[PDB]
Assembly symmetry: D3
Homo-oligomer: 269 residues x 6
């Protein structure tokens, strides 16, 4: 059972060899197993993965359709056993008012997760609704604290950050990896130029605290291996990419559909 | 909500147009959704689908790892809402000692299922163990009785049959579609042609209008299914679960993962 | 015989004609509901945010991934329905729930003994790009409108929150009996509220002239404020309170009583 | 998090200042939070609290309507996170034949409860029915044993006692506080004074420094508690539950509802 | 599937033939199955049966160790499928404050129960505690109302009665069978039972001449005791047994079998 | 609370004194309590116990009517608190794809079980169905691994074996007791002669790994004490008997039926 330090050494080794760190979301055990088979560097499981693999939108994991934290424990039964040599992280809902994080994080460690991520995250929420949440005890600060406690438990931490300010707070928390989240994936949101600017801004910020933080990109217009490649070319300090919808949903969806059509096409002589 | 008779017309019209009826298993909402996008004729959900998509073996669905009938109800929540114009059937564990068929089949229909299939089925089990089950109250006969009650409740019924005897028993229960299960993936392709034909001849002694699908054994792919259509004139299609959702999903996620892992800075 | 939807509407219209305001209440516990009925409230609505406010958490906890809202409302029915003897109790339904079959769940709620439904939790409370993304990916207010339309076909009393003239039209066309004009988290100025409520009233009226209109939210915090809205918004017939009805009164009373017991002293 | 001894010292310091110890029952997180907002000295949660805040009777917590010990674990997530500087105790059903008492108490400590009380308690049950319970393994002695075990785990213990004999057993068990229980909030005030004084005298035969609170029967309000303080020299406070949260919340929600129903718009 | 009317006919026919009606409590599927094998006339299932078959005391079913009404529903799947031609009744907790009686009785009928009995019953509770329960909405009168509503749904009803007053109340409710409950088995003297049962028969006859009357409880522990009562109480038509029917036989048989296996020795 | 070593020493002391070890299945708390009342040597609880006590067939515990591993945890509450001085073992479904053995076995130990047994077991399954299960991640060898791990946690292990090969595997895993399982209890199954041969072969196979391993008989036509005694007579290294259907189901069934008849037989006097 590798330590956090060993995992961070594993990654920084690949980074020095010019190899990207790719993390993936798994919503089913088959997803997890297939991602391991493609030599994925780390796998994360959250409620959104389930909902995604149910054919629903990713943002379904942020709303009142189920308890995120209880769903992730339930999903562990499906996923952990079929993954044999790849670290699996738990998406933790850090603002859960009915969870004691310290206890829950220990529980996740004993279940077998290598680490955690803050997901669902209020960082995806904007507007006056976001402001009210921050004002009434459902703030990103609480996610930051959750990451800090996880770090103190020697769990790997790969938190989503949406700004330099977030990048700092999570650096100071002891985050091993920062996933710069650009927004929901797939001309609605951020330009590719905006992503470049923000990601570089977060890199410079992160580094004010610590020069050896690993920084990966996720979301908005970064939708496919070529988009991920453009970020690696554009942002020097960025060394990889986290994908969930890109990794498991769209591929499966295409393949199942193509296969169905193929059977449907056969005719008798 | 289309009636059973409407669904049977739809299928019999496609058969007369020379089109195969293809049925599919969905272990996830995404599976069902993508099978509908591929214009599948019907979708069936059951525990084994869920376990396949968890990356376990199909037969995990037959063992003491969960209650099949409770799982299919839970899966209804994930699948039924994302399927818009395709009938969805419930795999029902007919030997369940703690179920009341009547009340349960009535529940599945209220929930929105278009029909039922006998799965998990003791018909996959063989040997002394199968004989012990048959003798101690867990018989395929009970799965036949379940399909009969389903029929009396005007549910579409697409049961698995394993022999001419099964095919007859199920034909009499009022089965709309007989899926000839060639069993454990083994039978040679030729053995399958001969047994499927025997079941068709058996079915046809009860009534001439029953729809017959193939599944299982070496029938792994579209050209295998085609081969059975060519060899068994009374056979009108194919049902696939593992072939439809598992191997395609598996291979696509792996390849996608590798494409992400293979990117390099310029 | 429990009253029919028509009979409740008749009951409310009769009070409106007498110049009595219609007061709707949120109940998060059975004691809340019972106490509201004791104060002659006209209707009671129960949902997760009620439970959570009575657990001392923020209202908006009911909108996030801390539980399944639609399961919780069903769980709450045994706490409330039995202690409410002659007042309609409605269920907040989460209309965008992807794992709900709408028609069967509404039918369930009717069989359980609910008189009606409201759309809560609601995406109407959500703004910005996040709302736009939700709207674009299957979690639209339009789904809540459809939920209400189906509830209406089942002859459930419907009392949806609306946040705009657009919402008011959509819900009015769905067959809403009562529109609750929600001004945001209990923000908008009082003048802003007068304007928007009047706009919602106008919007509802382009569809049907007999819809019952209640205010809620934003700065409308107390009887005086509700009355101001009544004076200012002639087509408004009342008020829906949740936080103002159960949380604040309970909080202040329990604090006071604790202090009262602590202040006791032996004679000496 | 303060230790058992740190809490007892705190109480004795108050007592030396001539200030009574007020204990409160809480059935919801809002109740707990409001009790802490009034600087209550300790909070105790259990099923009867939940049930009273659901509008039902206190004695509902004693019968086959739920599993007490599971309920109190469930209530922990509602109450513990919103209480910041007040000890919270768990009512434990000490005769529960499916609980392993030592494991359960351990779990409660780990969860973050400061201590325990024997509730539900068979001490409220009398007559032949009680005799049968005592003879068939549902005895008050098992509740005494549970408090003994709780005390060995350094949990604060605040048991109900119904007689001087109960007072000695719990004193001998290591109880920190004895709550003299006079019945459902029956006995006259004078009867209560004699019984409490009998319990104080019996407890004192074991330890001089045990804290004694009154609860129940005709002790309904602060004036009543005061009377007991005046009448019972060795008594140093009061535990309230029904009087602390149900009656206050009830009356407050009713009045607020009436205030809203009383509003009248200006003439048209 | 037999109607209530048909079962009562079936029973009266046996009575006219001089056969006693024997009812049994079943706490497991095997119990029910074995009781049918022995030509039991009816089977009633409830929490205490489960709990006795778990090795606990009968009175565990009355206290806060679980929800009785939820348990009877969970037991249905264990029992109903293995009973092929005997009526199975549900013990309903009639004072359950979280139960909606009309919908719950309807649920039970759908599931396939032939009838109901009031169990757990507050009739086993005495003293001031029972007076308190009676005064705060957990009264035998509610159990009477539950049986009345069950009779309206054409469920067979076999209530426990503890007095001539109970016998009249339940007779007027439409009870098909009154079970005269003498208290906890293995209390009342045998003579006290004869008198009370004769009083209940007399009281029931004031309402109707064709009610079926069974004995249960107290010293009525075995076939001989049951026969004594038949001989001593003319209007008594049989016996209901729960602890005597399943628990004691199973206990003794299992212990004997264990010793029989242990007794074996290798032979040279 | 006794250590595994103390339990083994206790059993071995009986054996040395010429007395058989008797193990029993309990599906209810009353059963467990009644078996302890007869000074049974050990008790094992699992879904098939519960299901037999619900009037269903033993093999119902193998099929998709429930999660065996969840059920045995649920049963603990019913049984552990009423057994005061007898080891109680948990049946563990070793091929459960959604269980992590290590953490589950720690839980069971912590919950208060003295040990474990492989039940439900694929050993009861034959034919091509069995072969398929073995080939697709549901093999008896996973049951062996579970026992190996339980042993490493110092849990008492009392697995079922169905062959000499099974006996060797379990012996190497550190099994304290092997239960030679002859098939479903009670013309259909193995003859007594077949049972004698198979048990004697397992005994010798096991003893080549560990001379002092404890061996009990179960199943097939070994239905009553005389049958169990016959096996003692015929299988010299067999030290006792594990009964489940025979220990609780049959005795209770018959006693409840006889009691019911006894009440139905009463009549008023002439
Ligand atoms: Cl409000
Ligand atoms: Cl609200
Ligand atoms: Cl009080
Ligand atoms: Cl009895
Ligand atoms: Cl069997
Ligand atoms: Cl046996």
């Amino acid at each position: 059972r590798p330590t956090r330090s060993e995992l961070v050494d594993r990654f920084q080794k690949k980074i020095r060899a010019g190899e990207p760190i790719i993390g993936g979301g798994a919503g089913t055990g088959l997803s997890a197993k297939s991602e391991e088979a493609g030599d994925i560097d780390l796998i994360v499981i959250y409620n959104s993965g389930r909902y995604r693999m149910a054919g629903r939108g990713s943002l379904a994991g942020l709303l009142a359709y189920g308890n995120a934290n209880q769903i992730v424990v339930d999903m562990a039964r499906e996923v952990l056993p079929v993954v044999r040599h790849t670290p699996v992280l738990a998406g933790v809902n850090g603002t859960d008012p009915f969870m004691v994080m310290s206890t829950f994080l220990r529980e996740l460690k004993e279940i077998g997760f290598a680490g955690v991520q803050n997901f669902p995250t209020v960082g995806l929420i904007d507007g006056l609704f976001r402001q009210n949440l921050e004002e009434t005890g459902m703030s990103y600060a609480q996610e930051v604290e959750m990451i800090a406690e996880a770090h103190k438990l020697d769990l790997l931490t790969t938190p989503y950050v949406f700004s330099p300010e977030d990048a700092v707070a999570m650096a100071k928390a002891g985050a091993d990896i920062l996933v710069c989240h650009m927004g929901l994936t797939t001309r609605s949101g951020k330009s590719m130029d905006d992503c470049v600017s923000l990601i570089n801004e977060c890199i410079e910020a992160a580094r004010t605290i610590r020069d050896d933080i690993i920084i990966l990109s996720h979301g908005g217009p970064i939708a496919n291996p070529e988009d991920a490649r453009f970020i690696l070319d554009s942002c020097q300090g960025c060394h990889g990419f986290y994908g969930a919808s890109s990794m498991e949903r769209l591929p499966a969806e295409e393949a199942i559909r193509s296969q169905t059509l193929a059977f449907k096409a056969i005719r008798r002589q």
